[PDB]
Amino acid sequence: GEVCPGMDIRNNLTRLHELENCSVIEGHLQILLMFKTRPEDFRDLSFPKLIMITDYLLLFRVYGLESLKDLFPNLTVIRGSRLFFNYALVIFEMVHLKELGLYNLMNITRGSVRIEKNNELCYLATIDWSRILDSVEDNHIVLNKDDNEECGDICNCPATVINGQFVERCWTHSHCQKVCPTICKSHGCTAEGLCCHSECLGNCSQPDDPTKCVACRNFYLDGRCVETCPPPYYHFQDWRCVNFSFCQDLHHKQYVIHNNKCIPECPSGYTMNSSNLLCTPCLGPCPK
Amino acid sequence: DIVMSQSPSSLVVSVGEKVTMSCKSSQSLLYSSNQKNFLAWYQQKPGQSPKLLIYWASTRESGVPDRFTGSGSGTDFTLTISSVKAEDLAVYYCQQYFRYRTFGGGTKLEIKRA
Amino acid sequence: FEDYLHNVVFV
Amino acid sequence: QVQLKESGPGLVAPSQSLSITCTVSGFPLTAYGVNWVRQPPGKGLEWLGMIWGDGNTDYNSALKSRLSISKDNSKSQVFLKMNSLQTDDTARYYCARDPYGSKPMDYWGQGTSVTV
Amino acid sequence: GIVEQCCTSICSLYQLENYCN
Amino acid sequence: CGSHLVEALYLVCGE
Ligand SMILES: *[C@@H]1O[C@H](CO)[C@@H](O[C@@H]2O[C@H](CO)[C@@H](O[C@@H]3O[C@H](CO)[C@@H](O)[C@H](O[C@H]4O[C@H](CO)[C@@H](O)[C@H](O)[C@@H]4O)[C@@H]3O)[C@H](O)[C@H]2NC(C)=O)[C@H](O)[C@H]1NC(C)=O
Ligand SMILES: *[C@@H]1O[C@H](CO)[C@@H](O[C@@H]2O[C@H](CO)[C@@H](O[C@@H]3O[C@H](CO)[C@@H](O)[C@H](O)[C@@H]3O)[C@H](O)[C@H]2NC(C)=O)[C@H](O)[C@H]1NC(C)=O
Ligand SMILES: *[C@@H]1O[C@H](CO)[C@@H](O)[C@H](O)[C@H]1NC(C)=O
Ligand SMILES: *[C@@H]1O[C@H](CO)[C@@H](O)[C@H](O)[C@H]1NC(C)=O
Secondary structure, eight states, X not given: OOEEEXXXXXXXXXXXXXXXXXXXXXXXXXXXXXXXXXXXXXXXXXXXXXXXXXXXXXXXXXXXXXXXXXTSTTOOEEOOSSOBTTEEEEEESOTTOOOOOOTTOOEEOSOXXXXXXXXXOOSSTTSOGGGTBSOOTTOEEESSGGGGTOOOOOOOOOEEESSSSEEEOXXXXXXXXXXXXXXXXXXXXXXXXXXXXXXXXXXXXSXXXXXXXXXXXXXXXXXXXESSOXXXXXXXXXXXXXXXXXXXXXXOOOOEEETTEEESSOOTTEEXXXXXXBEEEOSSSOOO | OOOEEEEOSEEEEOTTOOEEEEEEESSOOEXXXXXXXXXXXXXXXXXXXXXXXXXXXXXXXXXXXXXXXXXXETTEEEEEEOSOOGGGOOEEEEEEOSSSOEEOOOEEEEEOOO | OXXXXXXXXXX | OOEEEEEOOOXXXXXXXXXXXXXXXXXXXXXXXXXXXXXXXXXXXXXXXXXXXXXXXXXXXXXXXXXXXXXXXXXXXXXXXXXXXXXXXXXXXEEEEEOTTTOSOOOBOOOEEEBO | OHHIXXXXXXXXXXXXXXXXX | OHXXXXXXXXXXXXX
């Protein structure tokens, strides 16, 4: 599809069109501070092309927004290479939000979820988070309408044992939470429940095929999901492989190479040799 | 491209026993970024085209029985066949896939009878 | 945390 | 459905060139690499070259410009082209798949006979 | 930052006006 | 002053 930069969208909705053809946002996505927006500015708006965010997803004080089901219906993985505090998902003082509707979100690699102070918000206790996040211990979901024991939640779907009773699991009235059988794990499955290929992440358009993943689990290179970048390719942004040249181009006007990774900075104990971008250990103490 | 060397040129053994052949490279094959060695083992049952067996020098290919067991790290590698069954007879080769790809001179396995 | 949030989300 | 088969001319007189077509099916050539390997009868297996998903090429330095590897991805074909052969080039020629990122050489052709 | 400038410490106008998007 | 800091900042902007 497209890989675009981590964005910061505020005030006017107009800036939001910068995302229209994007499939992966390399970095984070932050949409915030829109005080004059109304329901009807969203009833015609969608980003079905966005499948993955590499860092974190963050929504804060966006008014008139009632569900995300039409905003990001097909976001499937959030990778959490960088986190906002400890969070890979932040839903905060999202006044007007009724329901989440990320019915396609299968996995949040790394981070935790913080969903707080969202009066109006239900369909939260109807989600089994343990099917999306590794560590849910540090989940922080309080002070939503859902905490008032008074929610009209309605969904067919499966029930999990999170509490002292099984609980039907769904996102909206018309979308169940997808659960893959236990041993498929993080790889995803078809509607029947045949496991997708083991190097795929959340979903696949076809079973048993590493070019037909919906979001690579390890690294992406040249169409396929792979275990690792072979040389002469370098690990980038902890999700995709590139050659020396790509990495170099970025650096010149602040990327460097070390451990076969392309990274912003040389790690401690190392200085940057000028001819080759390669971090080398220091001759005596490091001035840095 | 680097230089691979195997030993022996040929070996013989009878049914039931374990077998270990060796290989060596002119450069270290352990990939830093994931801690895996970039080496392969292939078996070629004779007259037929060869079959992939063991990659990252220890990862077993699906459809290979547990009796086949890969080892070694750095520049020096070994392949092990624990408990020989009848049609285990083949010529085995080492391949590096670190930079480009090159094969070893190979080593032949034979089986003992009358 | 609300602390974090502001400290960081501001031009 | 991963399958490879090589098309050799079989018989080549010295000082003339070798053109082999590896025809693959079941997978996209835009997403995997392909290797060329030969074996003279009862001798070793020899790596000749590979072509990556992106058109990138690797040749054994042994081949001093003698080797050219190119492709037609829309028609699932890989072309090896090798100049001015001698009798020491008498061998069985294979292409084999290369899942570079994840695997080494999975799936081989049955191999085609070439004699000089 | 703003949270230290205008919450722990109690603020005034300019302080804020400067901060406006 | 938490939530109000957000409210008060808006007062100021209209922006
Ligand atoms: C969602 O999908 C993932 C598969 O991608 C799935 O499994 C988890 O995957 C991650 C990444 O491969 C594993 O995390 C690593 O495990 C080791 C174990 O000791 C850690 O030490 C690692 O830490 C390193 O990597 C960090 C981040 O990448 C670096 O910041 C740090 O410097 C370290 O170098 C690393 O975290 C993880 O093991 C599995 N998790 C489990 C529980 O198996 C995950 O389960 C899927 N989630 C759900 C809900 O399905
Ligand atoms: C190193 O890596 C980069 C990034 O992967 C390579 O970029 C690739 O090369 C070409 C040249 O920029 C890209 O576009 C081409 O553009 C013209 C448009 O005028 C078009 O006619 C071509 O068909 C082609 O699309 C190409 O898309 C791009 N590939 C990728 C995966 O990003 C770069 O070339 C690499 N360098 C080497 C030496 O391999
Ligand atoms: C999306 O692609 C079309 C191609 O015609 C183009 O018109 C449009 O500007 C693109 N938008 C973005 C944000 O890249
Ligand atoms: C996964 O991809 C398939 C094929 O495009 C599609 O039918 C399905 O809606 C997607 N999402 C889920 C959650 O299965």
